[PDB]
């Protein structure tokens, strides 16, 4: 089935950096926008970061802008994201959830991309490890 | 007779009759070349989506 791992995530102080690598399987990541979102200790959860099928656009959120860069990589299936001056606020568990599968559906008709990509922009219907 | 013969073969392109989005100025260098006939703002070159199934 569909399967997304998260890893690179550990205990850090504020200032630094940190590389978490999401790897898929079971499709094609080639043109999957995926959503990296976090969950604080007591506290609902929260998006951090979007980046579209080709990487040609990404969304961060106000309050983690700049701090976070999101990247992809289709030849790995992989997708990574790299912070920047870390904040004690940060603690959460991070989460790399997927798009609203493959194509867009309109009327029992699924439409996919240009050069037959997997895009959308919807609900996150597969959630990773974490 | 021979060009309906040779059309015969050829695949229908009903289906592409469908609303398409298309974009003039596109990336690329030159759009006014340097003689001007009334042809330059004419371009007739966009580069345009379209659903197929
Ligand atoms: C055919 O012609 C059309 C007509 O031009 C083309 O479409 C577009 O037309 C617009 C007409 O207004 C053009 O607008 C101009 O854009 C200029 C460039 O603005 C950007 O660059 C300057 C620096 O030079 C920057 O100051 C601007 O704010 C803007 O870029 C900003 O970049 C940052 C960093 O990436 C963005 O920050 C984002 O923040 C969020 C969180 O909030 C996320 O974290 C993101 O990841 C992060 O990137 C910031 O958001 C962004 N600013 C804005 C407002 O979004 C500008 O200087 C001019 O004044 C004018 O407004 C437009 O450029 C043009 N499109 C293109 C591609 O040129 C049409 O494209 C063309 N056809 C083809 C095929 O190209
Ligand atoms: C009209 O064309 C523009 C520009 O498309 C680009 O230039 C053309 C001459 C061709 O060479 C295209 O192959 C080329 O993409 C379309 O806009 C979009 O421009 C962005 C540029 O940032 C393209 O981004 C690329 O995306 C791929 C895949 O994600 C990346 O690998 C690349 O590195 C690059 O970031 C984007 O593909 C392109 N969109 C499309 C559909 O090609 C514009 O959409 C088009 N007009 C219409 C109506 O489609
Ligand atoms: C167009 O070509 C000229 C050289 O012929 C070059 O100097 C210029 O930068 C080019 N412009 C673009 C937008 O590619
Ligand atoms: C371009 O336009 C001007 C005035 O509109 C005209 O005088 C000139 O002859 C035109 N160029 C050519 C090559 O005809």
């Known amino acids: 089935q569909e399967q997304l791992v998260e890893s690179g995530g550990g205990v850090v102080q504020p200032g630094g950096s940190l590389r978490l690598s999401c790897l898929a399987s079971?499709?094609?990541?080639?043109?999957?926008?995926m959503h990296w979102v976090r969950q604080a200790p007591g506290k609902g959860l929260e998006w951090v970061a979007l980046?579209?099928?080709?990487?040609?656009?990404?969304y961060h959120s106000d309050s983690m802008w700049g701090r976070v860069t999101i990247s992809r990589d289709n030849s790995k299936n992989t997708l990574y994201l790299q912070f920047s001056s870390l904040k004690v606020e940060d603690t959460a568990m991070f989460f790399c959830?997927?798009?609203?599968?493959?194509?867009?559906?309109?009327?029992?008709?699924?439409?996919?991309?240009?050069?037959?990509?997997?895009?959308?922009?919807?609900?996150?219907?597969?959630w990773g490890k974490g | 007779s021979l060009w309906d013969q040779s059309l015969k073969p050829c695949v229908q392109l009903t289906p592409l009759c469908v609303t398409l989005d298309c974009s003039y100025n596109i990336t690329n260098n030159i759009t006014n070349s340097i003689t001007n006939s009334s042809v330059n703002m004419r371009e007739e070159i966009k580069n345009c989506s379209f659903n197929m199934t």
């Open positions: 079971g499709f094609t990541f080639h043109k999957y926008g």
């Open positions: 980046i579209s099928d080709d990487g040609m656009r990404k």
């Open positions: 959830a997927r798009e609203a599968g493959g194509p867009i559906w309109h009327d029992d008709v699924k439409y996919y991309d240009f050069n037959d990509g997997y895009y959308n922009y919807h609900y996150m219907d597969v």
